[PDB]
Symmetry: D2
Subunit: 116 residues, 4 copies
């Protein structure tokens, strides 16, 4: 699994469950091409977005749908979503974990990059 | 100032100085139109972005050029930039402070909405 | 002011107002002795904790009563409090801002050390 | 495993490996009694601190030795350590994950509480 996303709820002390995550890859014409999407599990984790074969070099955007998450809990959040944009695999394949921590008016994201 | 942006360097323990920040407002056709911009001061703050008259309800995007910030310090960054996207709702007034805390492989952002 | 503390509510998007903050300095016997204290203002800031003369090099502990803050809002908190422990080293001057960002089950803290 | 600690390095984009973690429990006389200690693995995780039998109700302090971590990397950090203090199991056994994100001048901690 070369790309994993894990989301926690800092406000409620739980995994952020059923969070929609959309991944895009910058195309030759500078537009964002859809790449992969999924939802976090009961543990707040999203595995299986992509494969070693599919996850080529490129600029990737990971958009976490924080707004729908809060609205489903009956909460009016500040942000529309949380975006993480990065260049991947520039010096050969790496494994990326994008960790996100959510509160209605704040979020943090961190990347863990490991050499497989 | 209805909108202020404050950027801190959480790795080196300083304000993030001379960081480029661009603000966009969402247009009817779903494209982003430039709205305000500037560079953070020695205190990491960017004041005077907009006026009460210009800052109407809508969806705003704040794009912080974190990549150039880290490269100017000789430090390899993870992100291409940091984006903060939010809806301004009248409510009330109010005044919005968008704070961003930067590390080479992480950032956090918080909104402070005061009377 | 060589030492300032700023507390923000990351869950509700406001300054954390009227939060009790106690500062201690480490004594020779490894016990914590009270040094300064106060309650955050309407801006979430606590100014005037100490003076240049009183704030010598040493190990300092800042204890923020986050539990009472959340209970006053009717929100169940995880932590008993939030503690920030650090060494003040002359260096240079300098001026220290301890910022804390609070949510019911999380907090972050960053130090900003300016000239 | 009723108590787990996971530590990430936000400055370097890696798990925080070999981080010392000390846990204390508030005693009857209001002193901190040593409870458990360990070091994070290559994945930045620390399992096996305690057991269901040992982890009774109480006020617990989890002290993460962030200073030694940074000093071992040759970095002068701001903080002496990162403390997390909380009341545990007040309404019966729960599983706690304490997640920490470290930078030389900043850290964040979050708790995930689940009902086993």
């Amino acid at each position: 699994c070369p790309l994993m996303v894990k989301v926690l709820d800092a406000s409620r002390g739980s995994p952020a469950i059923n969070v929609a995550v959309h991944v895009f890859r910058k195309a030759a014409d500078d537009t964002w091409e859809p790449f992969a999407s999924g939802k976090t599990s009961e543990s707040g984790e999203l595995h299986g977005l992509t494969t070693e074969e599919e996850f080529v070099e490129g600029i990737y955007k990971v958009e976490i749908d924080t707004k729908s998450y809060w609205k489903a809990l009956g909460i009016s959040p500040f942000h529309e979503h949380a975006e993480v944009v990065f260049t991947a695999n520039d010096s050969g394949p790496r494994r990326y974990t994008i960790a996100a921590l959510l509160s209605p008016y704040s979020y943090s994201t961190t990347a863990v990059v490991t050499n497989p």
